[PDB]
Amino acid sequence: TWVVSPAEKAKYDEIFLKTDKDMDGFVSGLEVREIFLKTGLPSTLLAHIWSLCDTKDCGKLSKDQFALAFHLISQKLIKGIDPPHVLTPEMIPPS
Numbered sequence: 001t002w003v004v005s006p007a008e009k010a011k012y013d014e015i016f017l018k019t020d021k022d023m024d025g026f027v028s029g030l031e032v033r034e035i036f037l038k039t040g041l042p043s044t045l046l047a048h049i050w051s052l053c054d055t056k057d058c059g060k061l062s063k064d065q066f067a068l069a070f071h072l073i074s075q076k077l078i079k080g081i082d083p084p085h086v087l088t089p090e091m092i093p094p095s
């Protein structure tokens, strides 16, 4: 199960390749930044969305984690919906 996965994960999996400027399966807010700055969300929210997707809690956005953040930001670009407060069991990745 996962809040994001279909087209969304694809629309992102393709961006993570352009987001993870270090191609290390982990893009940092510093790279996805512009990508997040192109979204149109307020800094705080974008930083709040980074922790809402950075389930890795390591300081970077893994490959599938950066796809969970757009699941929120994207909702504000075409669905105008706030972010799901904090992390949820449907957001947290499988381990």
Ligand SMILES: [Ca+2]
Pocket (backbone or CB within 6 Å): 020, 021, 022, 023, 024, 026, 027, 028, 031, 060
């Ligand atoms: Ca990176």
